[PDB]
Amino acid sequence: AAQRYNELSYKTIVHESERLEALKHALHCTILASAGQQRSRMLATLFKDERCQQLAAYGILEKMYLDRIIRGNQLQEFAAMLMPHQKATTADGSSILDRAVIEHNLLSASKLYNNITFEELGALLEIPAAKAEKIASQMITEGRMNGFIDQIDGIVHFETREALPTWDKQIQSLCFQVNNLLEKISQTAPEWTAQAMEAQMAQ
């Protein structure tokens, strides 16, 4: 449903007002979804769409992108924007982020390192360890990831995320901060930059 609404909002033979209601509607179907790539990835797409800033769910949107915790006042309002059939619940159904942010963060994390505990992963995605463990398992099972779990020492080992690459990538980070420092030095005072370069050519 979310895809369909989103596509309508991108058409130019769709009336103006209705493009935005449709975007509003897309956001709401995207927020209710479960398991997989789409809920945080559509939130990011939606955030880049400048039209969401005319919406009242803009708050939830900006707060999710900037990774700011959600509170009671905002759930009450969102629940009220919902059409009656869309008040669809698991007996507590709400706005809960999770399916791209777990999945997207696991994909960003494979590019960041080697292997990790559940405690750290649960604490980082702000969910219980079991939910992470459940979605990680699903992702390994669907072959969109691979790994094995050590539940004796409470650690999942992944085809990349949090270990020997962390060491390698920290060397890269440190050396990039060195480059950054060289850029900042060139910006404030180019005089010392030229002068101190000639000091290397003397040695």
């Binding site: 020997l164 690459p165 060491w167 390698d168 990538k169 060397i171 890269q172 440190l174 050396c175 990039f176 480059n179």
Partner: protein, 311 residues
Amino acid sequence: SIDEIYKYDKKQQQEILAAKPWTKDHHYFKYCKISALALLKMVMHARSGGNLEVMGLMLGKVDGETMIIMDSFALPVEGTETRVNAQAAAYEYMAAYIENAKQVGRLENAIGWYHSHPGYGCWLSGIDVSTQMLNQQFQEPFVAVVIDPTRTISAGKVNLGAFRTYPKGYKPPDEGPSEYQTIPLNKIEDFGVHCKQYYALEVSYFKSSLDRKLLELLWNKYWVNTLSSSSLLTNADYTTGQVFDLSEKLEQSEAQLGRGSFMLGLETHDRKSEDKLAKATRDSCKTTIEAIHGLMSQVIKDKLFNQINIS
């Protein structure tokens, strides 16, 4: 010289093409000089394939035992490690290119082909040698070139060999060894037979003012990422594969030496399974050199960064 090399001479090629010395000897050539252009274009095109094979063409000339590679251009053709004489599909695009090239003022004839073997080394396969052997009859002059665009980033050394192969039923000499970049488990066999059929040629260069430098300066920042190659995990699959195959060869060696080659007033002559340990020792070296090369990427980090601590 430096400028004499840059000009092309149509007449020098006309004499050479009439004379046709290569019919006498196909091991004739010995040096290469490849343009800075030829090389950069060849690496970038190879890299655009990914880890998937691509072919391009080279324009050049020959002068004595030197081959000269003036320019190169890419082809959008698929058939490097499957289709025998993949180049044919490319012919229409080549005919266009040479015609377009002549009119701006580049008149130099096609010297040969380039392809690439990504993540398995610089060597010619069964498809490649078979396509070259037709080209040395028909296409002349025609030379094979191989480059790897992933291996190269780690080592910092350009692996580029321009080769030529010998025609069928030609006895190789004692010219064995070359650069050691590991092969996968089933590709090991294929190298083993083909290597003596060809030779690599040594390479020179020259330089001036738009492409080189964005790269040279960028390396001044960039240098950190090449030391975090960390091969041992990236191509973990290579070690297990070669070592299980090396074991099968030692079983072959135990029998070969053990029973002996059956011979009655005949003594072994050149073969790719003649003196099994002598072959085998070298296969151990291509797997060992890569492994320790992996250790050396690790050793550098450990000494340079980690020993500093906080004083």
